[PDB]
Amino acid sequence: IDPLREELTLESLSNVKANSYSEWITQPNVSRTIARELKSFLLEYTDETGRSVYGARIRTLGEMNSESLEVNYRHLAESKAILALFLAKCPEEMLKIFDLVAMEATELHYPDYARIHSEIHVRISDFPTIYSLRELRESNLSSLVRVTGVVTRRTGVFPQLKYVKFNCLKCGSILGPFFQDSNEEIRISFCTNCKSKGPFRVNGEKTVYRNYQRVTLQEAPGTVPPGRLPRHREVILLADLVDVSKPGEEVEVTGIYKNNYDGNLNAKNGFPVFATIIEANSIKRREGNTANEGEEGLDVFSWTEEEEREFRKISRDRGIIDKIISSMAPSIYGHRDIKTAVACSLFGGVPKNVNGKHSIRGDINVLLLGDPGTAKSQILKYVEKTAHRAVFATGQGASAVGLTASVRKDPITKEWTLEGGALVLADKGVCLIDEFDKMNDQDRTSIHEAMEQQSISISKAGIVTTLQARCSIIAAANPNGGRYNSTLPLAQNVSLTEPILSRFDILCVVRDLVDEEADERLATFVVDSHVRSHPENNARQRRLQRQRKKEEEISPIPQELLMKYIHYARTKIYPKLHQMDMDKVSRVYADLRRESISTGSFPITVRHLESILRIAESFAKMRLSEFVSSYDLDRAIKVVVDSFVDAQKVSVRRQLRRSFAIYT
Amino acid sequence: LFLLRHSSLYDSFYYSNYVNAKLSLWNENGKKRLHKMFARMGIPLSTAQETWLYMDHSIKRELGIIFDKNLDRYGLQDIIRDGFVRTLGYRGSISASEFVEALTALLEVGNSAQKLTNLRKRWVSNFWLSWDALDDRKVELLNRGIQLAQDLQRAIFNTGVAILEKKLIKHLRIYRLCVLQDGPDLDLYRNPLTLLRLGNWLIECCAESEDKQLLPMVLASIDENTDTYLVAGLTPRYPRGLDTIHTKKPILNNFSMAFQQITAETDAKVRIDNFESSIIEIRREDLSPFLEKLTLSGLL
Ligand SMILES: Nc1ncnc2c1ncn2[C@@H]1O[C@H](COP(=O)(O)OP(=O)(O)O)[C@@H](O)[C@H]1O
Numbered sequence: 001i002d003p004l005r006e007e008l009t010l011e012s013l014s015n016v017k018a019n020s021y022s023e024w025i026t027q028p029n030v031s032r033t034i035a036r037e038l039k040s041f042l043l044e045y046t047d048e049t050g051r052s053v054y055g056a057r058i059r060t061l062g063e064m065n066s067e068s069l070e071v072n073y074r075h076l077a078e079s080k081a082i083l084a085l086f087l088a089k090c091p092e093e094m095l096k097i098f099d100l101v102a103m104e105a106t107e108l109h110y111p112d113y114a115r116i117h118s119e120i121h122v123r124i125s126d127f128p129t130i131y132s133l134r135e136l137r138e139s140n141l142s143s144l145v146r147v148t149g150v151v152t153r154r155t156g157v158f159p160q161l162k163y164v165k166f167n168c169l170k171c172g173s174i175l176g177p178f179f180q181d182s183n184e185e186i187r188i189s190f191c192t193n194c195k196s197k198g199p200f201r202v203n204g205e206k207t208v209y210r211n212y213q214r215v216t217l218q219e220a221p222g223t224v225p226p227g228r229l230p231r232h233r234e235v236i237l238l239a240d241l242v243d244v245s246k247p248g249e250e251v252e253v254t255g256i257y258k259n260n261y262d263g264n265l266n267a268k269n270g271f272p273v274f275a276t277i278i279e280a281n282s283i284k285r286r287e288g289n290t291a292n293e294g295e296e297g298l299d300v301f302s303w304t305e306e307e308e309r310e311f312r313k314i315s316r317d318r319g320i321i322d323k324i325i326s327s328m329a330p331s332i333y334g335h336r337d338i339k340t341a342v343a344c345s346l347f348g349g350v351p352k353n354v355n356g357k358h359s360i361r362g363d364i365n366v367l368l369l370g371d372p373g374t375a376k377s378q379i380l381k382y383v384e385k386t387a388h389r390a391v392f393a394t395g396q397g398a399s400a401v402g403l404t405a406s407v408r409k410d411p412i413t414k415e416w417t418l419e420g421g422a423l424v425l426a427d428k429g430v431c432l433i434d435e436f437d438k439m440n441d442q443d444r445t446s447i448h449e450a451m452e453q454q455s456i457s458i459s460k461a462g463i464v465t466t467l468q469a470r471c472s473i474i475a476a477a478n479p480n481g482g483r484y485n486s487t488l489p490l491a492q493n494v495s496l497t498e499p500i501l502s503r504f505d506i507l508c509v510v511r512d513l514v515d516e517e518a519d520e521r522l523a524t525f526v527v528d529s530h531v532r533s534h535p536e537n538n539a540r541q542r543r544l545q546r547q548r549k550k551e552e553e554i555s556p557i558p559q560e561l562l563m564k565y566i567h568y569a570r571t572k573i574y575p576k577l578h579q580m581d582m583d584k585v586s587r588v589y590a591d592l593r594r595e596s597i598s599t600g601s602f603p604i605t606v607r608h609l610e611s612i613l614r615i616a617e618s619f620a621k622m623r624l625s626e627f628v629s630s631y632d633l634d635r636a637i638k639v640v641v642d643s644f645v646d647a648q649k650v651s652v653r654r655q656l657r658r659s660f661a662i663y664t
Numbered sequence: 665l666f667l668l669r670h671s672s673l674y675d676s677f678y679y680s681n682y683v684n685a686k687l688s689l690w691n692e693n694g695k696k697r698l699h700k701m702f703a704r705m706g707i708p709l710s711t712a713q714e715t716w717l718y719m720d721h722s723i724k725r726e727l728g729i730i731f732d733k734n735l736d737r738y739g740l741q742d743i744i745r746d747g748f749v750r751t752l753g754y755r756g757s758i759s760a761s762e763f764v765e766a767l768t769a770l771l772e773v774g775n776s777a778q779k780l781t782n783l784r785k786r787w788v789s790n791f792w793l794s795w796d797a798l799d800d801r802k803v804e805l806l807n808r809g810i811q812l813a814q815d816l817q818r819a820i821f822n823t824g825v826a827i828l829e830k831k832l833i834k835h836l837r838i839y840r841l842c843v844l845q846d847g848p849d850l851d852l853y854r855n856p857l858t859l860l861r862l863g864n865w866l867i868e869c870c871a872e873s874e875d876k877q878l879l880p881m882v883l884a885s886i887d888e889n890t891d892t893y894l895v896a897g898l899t900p901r902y903p904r905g906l907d908t909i910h911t912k913k914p915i916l917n918n919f920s921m922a923f924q925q926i927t928a929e930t931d932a933k934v935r936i937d938n939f940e941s942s943i944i945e946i947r948r949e950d951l952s953p954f955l956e957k958l959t960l961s962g963l964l
């Protein structure tokens with residue numbers, strides 16, 4: 001038997017006989033044992049359900065033509081503790097072996113996958129320990145670390161030489177290709193054959209290129225101590241990792257802590273100090289996901305095939321829309337009109353492009369004009385948590401170019417450049433503007449183009465460009481005087497102008513009135529919620545079970561399942577209108593215009609007919625239906641008419657409600 | 665496959681009646697299955713969507729072997745067939761099926777009683793475009809016909825998706841029924857040939873499969889410019905490429921006799937002027953009584 005082909009066992013693998021972990025892993029027999037154990041873990045691991053998680057993951061990976069297999073660290077730790085320890089201590093060689101064993105499990109399912117992607121990368125999802133850029137020390141060198149920060153700066157994607165080939169200047173012999181480290185340059189000093197002190201011209205008949213990118217990771221403002229300067233690190237993103245993190249975002253970086261010799265560093269400091277970097281292994285978008293940190297996986301909004309089947313099963317239910325509405329902010333007692341609007345905005349409409357000449361917005365904007373203590377900021381926070389991409393801004397905390405896009409001079413290239421804003425960051429998402437009425441006029445006026453054209457136009461310092469802002473806006477405002485005056489028209493209760501008001505699809509007026517029954521019910525619900533949330537009131541499985549039991553009381557649908565459902569519906573569902581009552585909608589629009597002719601009333605234009613259609617599309621989308629039904633159109637008509645009626649005065653509200661009773 | 669040599673491989677598999685029937689490409693599951701099949705064949709998605717001429721030559725040469733080893737897994741073993749391919753010096757090669765598809769597309773979309781006469785005059789005019797396409801000097805007409813065929817197949821696929829998602833195909837014991845009333849492309853289906861194309865698409869999909877007893881299908885469309893129907897009876901088809909004694913025997917189209925008998929007995933001003941006796945024109949109001957009598961006749 002060839003000794004190089006013999007293998008040890010797991011308990012013998014635990015016992016280390018080398019001077020270092022890397023030397024132990026690199027040994028032939030140990031490497032074979034590790035590869036065999038990793039393959040066994042990938043093939044045989046089962047979850048609580050009992051199905052192979054990684055088999056389905058590999059199937060999905062092959063279906064989408066991707067080159068990254070996500071492996072949860074906890075699964076490996078429970079299944080194989082020693083392998084998890086090796087991965088934590090020696091990420092490099094362990095990751096190499098893991099990558100090899102993954103293209104043999106992918107190839108197991110798709111035999112000819114090598115013709116699509118040559119190699120497959122393994123990405124670690126949930127490293128148990130999280131560090132700050134301040135906490136990094138020398139003891140973390142050459143070991144896997146998990147850090148969080150802000151992407152301050154970014155480079156363009158460059159092709160980097162995977163393998164470097166050298167040829168002697170003198171002799172002319174061409175040395176074999178050598179592995180290019182991501183961190184620092186590879187050079188040949190001593191020639192095997194020539195033995196020449198002289199340098200080698202670097203030449204190669206054929207070279208394989210690799211995607212390369214570098215970012216400047218900075219401590220997030222939230223985590224840095226107040227009033228202290230942030231610390232930063234340089235993160236290197238290799239192939240398949242490029243462009244995943246965009247400047248200004250908050251991310252969690254899983255990578256290898258590496259050091260290298262820097263001459264200028266030494267020169268400047270006067271001590272033998274080594275530069276440090278991070279080799280990114282995995283990136284998780286933490287932006288707007290502070291309250292979602294309790295979940296697992298690189299993306300909490302992604303779904304599996306079984307979850308898709310569950311989504312279909314849920315959608316087939318008749319009362320899906322009612323459950324979805326009831327599940328919006330379960331801790332808020334009532335306001336079933338502010339929950340319906342929020343759900344409609346979250347799901348959104350279908351943008352349309354007629355013959356390539358006419359562009360129609362497909363997003364829904366909502367405005368909350370109400371009393372001081374009617375749970376508006378909490379609703380905005382919930383929307384931020386649930387939405388896939390959300391941005392939160394305050395009244396005076398937002399500038400006219402902090403929203404939209406701004407122009408700066410690039411520190412490196414000394415040239416004018418373009419930066420994104422709130423709107424940009426909220427592309428295909430939601431922008432939340434609390435304290436809308438306290439906004440500066442200038443600031444307010446900025447969003448006019450963005451809210452309808454879904455685009456940002458910039459003409460500054462020789463920069464002539466148009467961006468994409470396909471973001472919905474939900475805003476909370478306080479009526480003039482600090483309290484709504486139901487006697488006066490809507491226009492006199494707020495300082496907003498006709499265009500901005502017209503740009504809002506749904507208006508939700510919130511009134512605080514003293515009523516014995518309403519006060520009793522609201523107080524009872526608030527007290528019950530406060531008692532429910534008291535901190536005092538397997539171990540992980542037990543915690544999840546008790547959390548699920550607590551959630552079941554107030555929400556018919558799990559919150560995480562709800563977020564996944566919303567993301568799936570937005571991504572994969574585009575309803576269309578083919579059968580609909582033209583006369584009904586036309587008459588509703590005409591009646592709305594006739595009733596809105598009154599001075600000081602809520603503005604009505606074609607925008608609101610389009611908003612009726614958009615809300616019908618959104619209601620159809622809530623059921624994962626490919627076609628808008630008559631019921632959805634009726635519901636949208638009822639919503640719009642109810643909002644319009646509620647926006648009126650006390651004196652004429654009864655007459656308006658009696659007149660419009662047919663549609664509602 | 666639909667126009668393999670003048671479109672992409674992905675489009676060829678996507679817009680084929682047989683592939684859609686055997687995979688149900690009208691929903692997300694079918695698309696996922698097709699993507700999985702393409703991934704196991706070793707063809708990248710970007711490569712598959714590349715046009716036929718510029719597709720990587722290695723994959724094009726290996727296509728025969730790749731199909732030989734992978735199509736059986738997904739039940740598409742019938743895609744393998746022998747056809748006639750004609751080539752001219754330094755020109756592209758076109759198969760007989762693609763030529764027929766181009767000719768039919770030119771015939772279909774090439775470009776009260778008065779409107780009917782004008783429509784039939786337009787069809788007579790399209791006949792001459794189809795005739796001209798048969799010449800070797802007029803190749804631009806053939807390319808235009810190929811493009812129109814692609815567009816028409818796309819439209820028919822959309823209409824079929826709409827029909828199947830809405831579950832518009834009512835099932836009666838004697839026969840199936842499907843009526844179009846508020847589609848997006850109702851105008852295209854005034855031509856009998858386009859209606860027959862849609863009927864064949866629907867017959868192969870979810871009916872030839874599913875192990876359901878063969879039943880003749882009724883397909884009807886509506887045009888608002890004249891306020892009348894175009895009813896077309898369609899004979900059932902056995903599973904494709906399944907040699908059997910019962911498959912050897914043919915299935916006759918009995919709808920002409922039943923339609924004639926109903927028209928003679930009833931009073932609805934029906935038109936049986938078309939050469940294909942199974943295709944008739946029915947007034948808007950009379951379709952419900954006509955279908956009642958058809959169900960009660962039992963001669964289908
Ligand atoms: N309908 C309600 N149900 C439950 N809690 C409520 C409700 N209305 C108000 N609250 C409570 O009162 C507080 C209202 O503060 P907040 O809504 O942030 O002020 P604003 O309405 O000015 O944004 C919240 O902490 C919330 O818990």
Ligand SMILES: [Mg+2]
Nearest residue numbers: 376377434476
């Ligand atoms: Mg507030």
Ligand SMILES: [Zn+2]
Nearest residue numbers: 168171191194
């Ligand atoms: Zn040499």
